[PDB]
Amino acid sequence: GPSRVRQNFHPDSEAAINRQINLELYASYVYLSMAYYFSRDDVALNNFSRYFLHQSREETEHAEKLMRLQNQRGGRIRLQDIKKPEQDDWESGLHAMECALLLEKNVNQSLLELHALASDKGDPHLCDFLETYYLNEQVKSIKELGDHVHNLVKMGAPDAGLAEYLFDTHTLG
Amino acid sequence: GPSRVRQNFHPDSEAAINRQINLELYASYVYLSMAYYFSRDDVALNNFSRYFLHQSREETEHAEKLMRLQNQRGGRIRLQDIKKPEQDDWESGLHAMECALLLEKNVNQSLLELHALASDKGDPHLCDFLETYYLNEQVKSIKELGDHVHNLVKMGAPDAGLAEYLFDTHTLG
Amino acid sequence: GPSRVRQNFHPDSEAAINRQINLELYASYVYLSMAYYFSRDDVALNNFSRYFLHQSREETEHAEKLMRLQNQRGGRIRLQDIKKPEQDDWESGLHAMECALLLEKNVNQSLLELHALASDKGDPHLCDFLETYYLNEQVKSIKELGDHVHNLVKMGAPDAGLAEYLFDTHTLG
Amino acid sequence: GPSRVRQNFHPDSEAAINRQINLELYASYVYLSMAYYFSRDDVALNNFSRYFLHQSREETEHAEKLMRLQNQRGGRIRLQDIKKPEQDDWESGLHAMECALLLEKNVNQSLLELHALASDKGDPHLCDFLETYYLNEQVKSIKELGDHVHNLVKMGAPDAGLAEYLFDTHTLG
Amino acid sequence: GPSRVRQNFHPDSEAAINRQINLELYASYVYLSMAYYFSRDDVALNNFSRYFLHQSREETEHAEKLMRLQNQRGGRIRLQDIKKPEQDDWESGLHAMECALLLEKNVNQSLLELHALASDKGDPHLCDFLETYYLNEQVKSIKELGDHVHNLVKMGAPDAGLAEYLFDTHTLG
Amino acid sequence: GPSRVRQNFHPDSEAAINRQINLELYASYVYLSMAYYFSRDDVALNNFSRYFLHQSREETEHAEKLMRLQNQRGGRIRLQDIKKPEQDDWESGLHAMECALLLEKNVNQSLLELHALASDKGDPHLCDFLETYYLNEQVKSIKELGDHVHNLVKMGAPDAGLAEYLFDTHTLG
Ligand SMILES: [Cl-]
Ligand SMILES: [Cl-]
Ligand SMILES: [Cl-]
Ligand SMILES: [Cl-]
Ligand SMILES: [Cl-]
Ligand SMILES: [Cl-]
Ligand SMILES: [Cl-]
Ligand SMILES: [Cl-]
Ligand SMILES: [Cl-]
Ligand SMILES: [Cl-]
Ligand SMILES: [Cl-]
Ligand SMILES: [Cl-]
Ligand SMILES: [Cl-]
Ligand SMILES: [Cl-]
Ligand SMILES: [Cl-]
Ligand SMILES: [Cl-]
Ligand SMILES: [Cl-]
Ligand SMILES: [Cl-]
Ligand SMILES: [Cl-]
Ligand SMILES: [Cl-]
Ligand SMILES: [Cl-]
Ligand SMILES: [Cl-]
Ligand SMILES: [Cl-]
Ligand SMILES: [Cl-]
Ligand SMILES: [Cl-]
Ligand SMILES: [Cl-]
Ligand SMILES: [Cl-]
Ligand SMILES: [Cl-]
Ligand SMILES: [Cl-]
Ligand SMILES: [Cl-]
Ligand SMILES: [Cl-]
Ligand SMILES: [Cl-]
Ligand SMILES: [Cl-]
Ligand SMILES: [Cl-]
Ligand SMILES: [Cl-]
Ligand SMILES: [Cl-]
Ligand SMILES: [Cl-]
Ligand SMILES: [Cl-]
Ligand SMILES: [Cl-]
Ligand SMILES: [Cl-]
Ligand SMILES: [Cl-]
Ligand SMILES: [Cl-]
Ligand SMILES: [Cl-]
Ligand SMILES: [Cl-]
Ligand SMILES: [Cl-]
Ligand SMILES: [Cl-]
Ligand SMILES: [Cl-]
Ligand SMILES: [Cl-]
Ligand SMILES: [Cl-]
Ligand SMILES: [Cl-]
Ligand SMILES: [Cl-]
Ligand SMILES: [Cl-]
Ligand SMILES: [Cl-]
Ligand SMILES: [Cl-]
Ligand SMILES: [Cl-]
Ligand SMILES: [Cl-]
Ligand SMILES: [Cl-]
Ligand SMILES: [Cl-]
Ligand SMILES: [Cl-]
Ligand SMILES: [Cl-]
Ligand SMILES: [Cl-]
Ligand SMILES: [Cl-]
Ligand SMILES: [Cl-]
Ligand SMILES: [Cl-]
Ligand SMILES: [Cl-]
Ligand SMILES: [Cl-]
Ligand SMILES: [Fe+2]
Ligand SMILES: [Fe+2]
Ligand SMILES: [Fe+2]
Ligand SMILES: [Fe+2]
Ligand SMILES: [Fe+2]
Ligand SMILES: [Fe+2]
Ligand SMILES: [Fe+2]
Ligand SMILES: [Fe+2]
Ligand SMILES: [Fe+2]
Ligand SMILES: [Fe+2]
Ligand SMILES: [Fe+2]
Ligand SMILES: [Fe+2]
Ligand SMILES: [Fe+2]
Ligand SMILES: [Fe+2]
Ligand SMILES: [Fe+2]
Ligand SMILES: [Fe+2]
Ligand SMILES: [Fe+2]
Ligand SMILES: [Fe+2]
Ligand SMILES: [Fe+2]
Ligand SMILES: [Fe+2]
Ligand SMILES: [Fe+2]
Ligand SMILES: [Fe+2]
Ligand SMILES: [Fe+2]
Ligand SMILES: [Fe+2]
Ligand SMILES: [Fe+2]
Ligand SMILES: [Fe+2]
Ligand SMILES: [Fe+2]
Ligand SMILES: [Fe+2]
Ligand SMILES: [Mg+2]
Ligand SMILES: [Mg+2]
Ligand SMILES: [Mg+2]
Ligand SMILES: [Mg+2]
Ligand SMILES: [Mg+2]
Ligand SMILES: [Mg+2]
Ligand SMILES: [Mg+2]
Ligand SMILES: [Mg+2]
Ligand SMILES: [Mg+2]
Ligand SMILES: [Mg+2]
Ligand SMILES: [Mg+2]
Ligand SMILES: [Mg+2]
Ligand SMILES: [Mg+2]
Ligand SMILES: [Mg+2]
Ligand SMILES: [Mg+2]
Ligand SMILES: [Mg+2]
Ligand SMILES: [Mg+2]
Ligand SMILES: [Mg+2]
Ligand SMILES: [Mg+2]
Ligand SMILES: [Mg+2]
Ligand SMILES: [Mg+2]
Ligand SMILES: [Mg+2]
Ligand SMILES: [Mg+2]
Ligand SMILES: [Mg+2]
Ligand SMILES: [Mg+2]
Ligand SMILES: [Mg+2]
Ligand SMILES: [Mg+2]
Ligand SMILES: [Mg+2]
Ligand SMILES: [Mg+2]
Ligand SMILES: [Mg+2]
Ligand SMILES: [Mg+2]
Ligand SMILES: [Mg+2]
Ligand SMILES: [Mg+2]
Ligand SMILES: [Mg+2]
Ligand SMILES: [Mg+2]
Ligand SMILES: [Mg+2]
């Protein structure tokens, strides 16, 4: 139009928000895949399943809050295909946790690049939005996954027969 | 393996369930797109938005129950890309309702084909699963959307200035 | 003195905060004027009246929080005349909403300039204050007013006899 | 028009009500200024601050009830600039109380002149409105401020170091 | 390692966080010293004591939240000696309040330097952490202490026999 | 002065109480260090962390009760630097427990020496104070830590992958 609401909102920021929406939906899909891997009859770690299903739902919330931001600022949402996750078989509780940690660091790098763009475009509203709802959530998620990876490694996962079972019961229960 | 749980579960049924999972996730994504279209500053039909967001969440439930079925029967979930919806701009409340009706009939045709396959493979568990959780839900959804389309058409949508506003307040409120 | 509390608080920031206090009080006065326009016997849109009276009270809160900030940082409040609003007769519900939208964008531009000044003066406390209490409130207000303008335009306001009446009852009720 | 509601409402009364609205808003602004003076780091009399903030809010109520009267009688509200208060620095608790007392007597004189005009124009509704909501409130406010001035003078304000502190705690607490 | 969690976290920021932890613990110790000065038999200002004990506990919280941040970001906490406070005898309620005000401004300068470093290193997570939990808390603490100093000075502390006693009862009670 | 409260309170006892205050604060700091070691991403034993944070807070209470005693008896508190703990990296749950046990025995030896001094100076109030609040608390703490060390040793800590994890969940949970 521009939109009668649009103010101080650079087209590059609008485009970067659309790419972030897609990445959050991708993260949601990765976690959904992991959740149902852990409910296979030959895996059957029900608290790993619950943990990743919860993470999946949180990532859909992350996507939705960026879709809301786009509308609030007068941008136009442009959805793209949600790519399937990299693996069909997540191999073990430890491997899934390590893949989740890498995913969260990759999404964090994307958010830091978006914050740098918002700063370059003099968009303090977008900077604050990312700082308030994304950057600390990402740090907390990365730390939690790092904690989980460390315990599973120390316990002897994936080959130590009791490790993932006990972690499933005692940490994720 | 086969899976130590697998019994009377044809590979074609397993593959058809994976395709249905993808279609339900696609339907979820279409509805998510519609929900955020209706919260644009130049659309602002908040109960259309709420209605389609609810439909989106129900379709993710539909996908998840098929993912659970795959695991229960000892099949292996194989996820694929979730294609973006056909439209970025859903044009009007009436157009979105008509597109939703067509989507629901297309998903119903897929479910009827899956039921015919399950029947051909002598899989009464899969037949009952579809009849119990999918086929009546689809008939109810198609009827509700048809009701909504009829009222919006009769009221003069999309060009009659009061029609979508009043429908948003009085039916979807 | 300087004030025994003052630290990292530039005189230009102090002056810009005094100008912002005046602008928030002006916005409060505009909304008060609009509120009582809608309770005229020849307008009588009581929910438009309530809506703008609420917006008036929120703007006085906005002014007061900046007056508090000035004292917290050791600046000195310098009040100026609160100019009367631009119009005595706001013409219609749609016209008042469009004028409110323009007011909110003008106040937002002032807040963005204040944030740029605070950034230039290395005042992260003032930057955070604006981001936490002003910039997202402004984006939400601009979006809400844009939504309202769109519905009133589509409904045929101001000339369509039912439009402002129905909007008053169903959105602002 | 005249307004289809207007009856026995002289144009001079309508104009005098508009001037009274402005004076009540001015009184509100004076009290707001005083409230934030008392929360300066070098004044810090928090119950003086609370007292004057309350008086400020009451004066805005006084303005609003006259704006309502104008609409009820079919007059047209005509707002004017709200002049800034006379002082930026209110010097002491005693000085602020003495200035408030003078303000209230000046506003009372304006209300008595308005009542005399209403009487001259044979407007018993306007006479009763002023008697019911303004004249006794003004007498009570003037008496309360006189009480406060007397105690502060007797206690040795502003130079007696304990006087304003103790009055703030024990009377305004 | 680096830590499998570490991302966008500069070694200089890690070191500056360790120095800030020490400074917050120092502030805690200063306040603890002041608290027990006020419970001496020859001072016996129990609400000054309570006030400073509370401030001591808040500073330990400030230290702990930075220790948590270090772990969240994958830095390594490096503790140093907590230096004893500057004075054994805090002389008076007024002198302790003035020393606390200077301490809070010195800690604020350290936090502003840390924020400038975080900005220089492109660490928006660390910038937001400081803005969210430290910079406004510091401004509020400095303002409260300035208020307290002003009242005690005006009341005639420390030599006016009633001043600190009355302030202890009426402000800090 | 002496203090108008001082009675039967030897200067050597006063000095020994000041040294004990410092030692209790040191113990508090050791435990604080241990608490945050266990929340590292590469340790992540959250109940070890909670356990040592609680012990840290108890030691600050121990310091404060001696500071209160000094004031009650008319002595003068003389604070000294709180030395940093001996280790930055506590190596394992078992090593931290063994270091805590040694710390508690060293603090107990200090308390026994203080009791012997109080006895030598004919100070039954100080003897009773130590017996009532310190000596049994120390015996209980040493016994609890010995219990914890024994279980961790028997379970195969630190090298047995499940030992510290299971102890964290089942004893410290
Ligand atoms: Cl723009
Ligand atoms: Cl994309
Ligand atoms: Cl794509
Ligand atoms: Cl590709
Ligand atoms: Cl970007
Ligand atoms: Cl950045
Ligand atoms: Cl910016
Ligand atoms: Cl966050
Ligand atoms: Cl963990
Ligand atoms: Cl590890
Ligand atoms: Cl094992
Ligand atoms: Cl089979
Ligand atoms: Cl597919
Ligand atoms: Cl595909
Ligand atoms: Cl294609
Ligand atoms: Cl099929
Ligand atoms: Cl069939
Ligand atoms: Cl069958
Ligand atoms: Cl069904
Ligand atoms: Cl319908
Ligand atoms: Cl029809
Ligand atoms: Cl119509
Ligand atoms: Cl300054
Ligand atoms: Cl101004
Ligand atoms: Cl002016
Ligand atoms: Cl002018
Ligand atoms: Cl500016
Ligand atoms: Cl800026
Ligand atoms: Cl800055
Ligand atoms: Cl905000
Ligand atoms: Cl609306
Ligand atoms: Cl429009
Ligand atoms: Cl109409
Ligand atoms: Cl008339
Ligand atoms: Cl006037
Ligand atoms: Cl004027
Ligand atoms: Cl003038
Ligand atoms: Cl008059
Ligand atoms: Cl009269
Ligand atoms: Cl009369
Ligand atoms: Cl009255
Ligand atoms: Cl009085
Ligand atoms: Cl008098
Ligand atoms: Cl006095
Ligand atoms: Cl890094
Ligand atoms: Cl240090
Ligand atoms: Cl040192
Ligand atoms: Cl030194
Ligand atoms: Cl620094
Ligand atoms: Cl900075
Ligand atoms: Cl940055
Ligand atoms: Cl803060
Ligand atoms: Cl104070
Ligand atoms: Cl002063
Ligand atoms: Cl005195
Ligand atoms: Cl003695
Ligand atoms: Cl010592
Ligand atoms: Cl030392
Ligand atoms: Cl040494
Ligand atoms: Cl000893
Ligand atoms: Cl002994
Ligand atoms: Cl004895
Ligand atoms: Cl004991
Ligand atoms: Cl044990
Ligand atoms: Cl043993
Ligand atoms: Cl083991
Ligand atoms: Fe999460
Ligand atoms: Fe959650
Ligand atoms: Fe996310
Ligand atoms: Fe995430
Ligand atoms: Fe267990
Ligand atoms: Fe539905
Ligand atoms: Fe539902
Ligand atoms: Fe479905
Ligand atoms: Fe459906
Ligand atoms: Fe609002
Ligand atoms: Fe509100
Ligand atoms: Fe505002
Ligand atoms: Fe506003
Ligand atoms: Fe910032
Ligand atoms: Fe009053
Ligand atoms: Fe009142
Ligand atoms: Fe008044
Ligand atoms: Fe008044
Ligand atoms: Fe009193
Ligand atoms: Fe505090
Ligand atoms: Fe507190
Ligand atoms: Fe602090
Ligand atoms: Fe502080
Ligand atoms: Fe922020
Ligand atoms: Fe203990
Ligand atoms: Fe305890
Ligand atoms: Fe102890
Ligand atoms: Fe101990
Ligand atoms: Mg564009
Ligand atoms: Mg992408
Ligand atoms: Mg499950
Ligand atoms: Mg592909
Ligand atoms: Mg495996
Ligand atoms: Mg936050
Ligand atoms: Mg196969
Ligand atoms: Mg398909
Ligand atoms: Mg909505
Ligand atoms: Mg395509
Ligand atoms: Mg259209
Ligand atoms: Mg049924
Ligand atoms: Mg100046
Ligand atoms: Mg201005
Ligand atoms: Mg009304
Ligand atoms: Mg003018
Ligand atoms: Mg008109
Ligand atoms: Mg916010
Ligand atoms: Mg006229
Ligand atoms: Mg006047
Ligand atoms: Mg106050
Ligand atoms: Mg003037
Ligand atoms: Mg003065
Ligand atoms: Mg009366
Ligand atoms: Mg290093
Ligand atoms: Mg230092
Ligand atoms: Mg006490
Ligand atoms: Mg020294
Ligand atoms: Mg002294
Ligand atoms: Mg804040
Ligand atoms: Mg001596
Ligand atoms: Mg020692
Ligand atoms: Mg913890
Ligand atoms: Mg040393
Ligand atoms: Mg080790
Ligand atoms: Mg006992």
How far does residue C113's CA lie from ligand 27's centre (Å)? 5
DSSP C13-66: HHHHHHHHHHHHHHHHHHHHHHHHHTTSTTT--HHHHHHHHHHHHHHHHHHHHH
Q: How far is B67 from F22, CA to CA, in rounded Å?
A: 62
- The end-to-end CA distance of chain E, in Å, is 52
Q: Which two tokens stand for residue C88?
A: 């005595």
Q: How far off is chain E from F85, nearest CA to CA, in Å?
A: 8
Is C4 part of any domain? Answer: no
CB C140 within 8 A of CB A129: no
Show residues of chain E in contact with D44, CB under 8 Å.
146-148, 150-151
Angle (CA) B87-B93-B97 rounded to 5° is 75
- The span from the CA of A80 to the CA of A22, in Å, is 7
Specify if E93 maps to a domain. yes
Residue F72 lies in a domain: yes
CA separation for the pair F36, E104 (Å, rounded): 25
Range of the domain at E64: 11-171
Q: What DSSP line would sit under A37-80, residue for residue?
A: HTTSTTT--HHHHHHHHHHHHHHHHHHHHHHHHHHHHT------
Cβ neighbours of residue D71 under 8 Å, at least 6 residues apart? C36, C39, C40, C41, D77
Residues of E in contact with C73 (CB under 8 A): 139
Whether A143 sits inside 8 A of E3 (CB atoms) is: no
| Of B38, B40, B58, B33, nearest in space to B49 by CA | B38
Report how far apart, in Å, the C-alpha atoms of E111 and of each of B44, E20, E22, E127 are. Answer: 44, 8, 12, 10
Do E141 and E101 meet the contact criterion of CB atoms below 8 Å apart?
A: no
Q: Give the nearest partner residue to A122 out of C109, C116, C136, using CB atoms.
A: C116
| F43 close to F37: Cβ distance less than 8 angstroms | yes
Are C21 and C67 spatial neighbours (Cβ–Cβ below 8 Å)? yes
Chain-centre distance for alpha carbon F78: 19
Q: Is B82 strand, coil or helix?
A: strand
What does the block give as tokens for F167?
A: 């102890």
F90 contacts: CB under 8 Å, gap ≥ 6: F33, F34, F37, F38, F96, F99
Residues A98, A99, A103, A108, Cα dihedral to 10°? 10
C-alpha–C-alpha distance, residues F131 and F125, integer Å? 10
How many Cβ atoms are within 10 Å of F147's Cβ, its own excluded?
12
Locate F69 and state its tokens: 């005693």
Q: Cα separations (Å) of A9 from A22, B169, C136, F107?
A: 20, 31, 13, 63
AA letter at E137:
E
Ligand nearest to the CA of A130: 8
Total count of domains within chain B: 1
**Alpha-carbon distance values, B96 to B87, B103, B137, B145, F164 (Å):** 10, 10, 20, 10, 58
Per the CB < 8 Å rule, is A36 touching B67?
yes
Confirm whether F90 is domain-assigned: yes
Neighbouring CB atoms inside 10 A of E39's CB total 21
The amino acid present at A147, given as its one-letter code, is: D
Vertex A170 angle, CA A167 and A171, to 5°: 70
User: What is the gyration radius of the CA atoms in chain C, in angstroms?
Assistant: 18
Give F125-171 as a DSSP string. HHHHHHIIIIIHHHHHHHHHHHHHHHHHHHHTTTTSTTHHHHHHHHT
Cβ-contact C59, D53 below 8 angstroms: no
Query: What CA–CA distance (Å, rounded) separates B87 from B98?
Result: 13
Subunits with 3+ Cβ pairs within 8 Å of A are B, C, E, F
Question: How far is the centre of ligand 93, averaged over its atoms, from the C-alpha of F135 (Å)?
Answer: 9
DSSP state at residue A33: H
Q: What residues does the ion ligand 69 have nearby, CB within 5 Å?
A: A 24, 59, 62
Distance CA C79, CA B160 (A): 50
Residue B36: CB partners within 8 Å, gap ≥ 6? Answer: A67, A68, A70, A71, A77, B49
Q: Which residues are CB-contacts of A42 (< 8 A; sequence separation ≥ 6)?
A: B1, B3, B4
- Residue C141 CA, distance from chain mean position: 8
**CB count in 10 Å sphere of residue F150:** 11
Measured distance CA(C142)–CA(B43) in Å, rounded: 15
* Residue F71 resides in a domain: yes
d(CA E1, CA D169): 59
Tell me how far the alpha carbon of residue E137 is from its chain's centroid. 10
Residue C126 domain-assigned (yes or no): yes
Whether residue C3 lies inside any domain: the answer is: no
Tokens 């039909």 locate to B45
Nearest to A131 among E8, E71, E124 (CB): E124
> How far from chain centre, in Å, is Cα C134?
10
- Cα gap F167→F173, rounded to integer Å: 8
Under a CB-based contact definition with an 8 Å cutoff, are residues F99 and F87 in contact?
A: yes
DSSP conformation class of F55: H
- Tracing tokens 């509780």 back to the chain, one arrives at A93
Q: Rounded distance, CA D9 to CA D25, Å?
A: 23
Which of B104, B97, B89 minimizes the C-alpha distance to B28? B104
Tokens of A122: 């003099």
> ∠ CA(F85), CA(F88), CA(F90), 5° rounding?
95
CA distances from residue C74 to C16, E90, F30, F133 in whole angstroms, order as listed: 14, 26, 40, 47
DSSP 8-state symbol, C122: T
Q: Residue C94 and residue C164: Cα distance in Å, rounded?
A: 8
Across the interface, which of E105, E131, E149 has its CB nearest the CB of C124?
Answer: E131
Experimental technique of record: X-ray
Binding annotation of C for Fe cation = 24, 59, 62, 104, 138
Contact F17, F75 (CB under 8 A): yes
Both structure tokens of B97: 């309702």
Structure-block tokens of residue D96:
């602020």
- Kindly state the tokens that stand for D145: 């401020």
Spatial contact of D56 and D32, defined as CB atoms under 8 Å apart: yes
Q: Which of D172, D168, D164, D129 is nearest to D16 (CA)?
A: D129
Residue matched to tokens 């605070």: C118
Measured torsion, CA atoms of residues A151, A153, A155, A159, in degrees rounded to the nearest 10:
140
Question: What CATH number does residue E24 fall under?
Answer: 1.20.1260.10
Q: Would you state the structure tokens that stand for residue E62, as one six-digit string? A: 């400030």
How far, in Å, CA of B101 to CA of C138, rounded?
Answer: 38
AA letter at E109: Q
Tokens of E103: 């301490």
Choose the mutation target among E97, E112, E139 for the interface with C, i.e. most C CBs under 10 Å.
E139
Cα–Cα distance between E111 and E135 in angstroms, integer? Answer: 7
Instruction: State the virtual CA torsion across E110, E111, E116, E121 in degrees, nearest 10.
Output: 110
Contacts of D167 (CB under 8 A, 6+ apart): D93, D148, D151, D152, D155, D157
Nearest to A82 among B67, B76, B81 (CB): B81
What's the gap between Cα A58 and its chain centre? 8
State how far the Cα of C57 lies from the Cα of C77, in Å rounded to an integer.
Answer: 20
Cβ contact, residue pair F77, E33, below 8 Å: yes
Written as six digits, the tokens of C97 are: 């909403």
- Considering every ligand atom, which ligand is closest to the CA of E11? 119
Measured at the CA of B116, the angle between CA B112 and CA B122, to 5 degrees, comes to 140
Q: How many residues does chain C have?
A: 173
Is B3 inside a domain boundary? no
CB C141 within 8 A of CB C86: no
Which residues hold their Cβ within 5 A of ligand 113, which is an ion?
A: D 11
Measure the CA–CA gap between A50 and B77, rounded to whole angstroms.
17
- C-alpha–C-alpha distance, residues C94 and C96, integer Å: 5
Cα separation, D70 vs B117, in Å, equals: 77
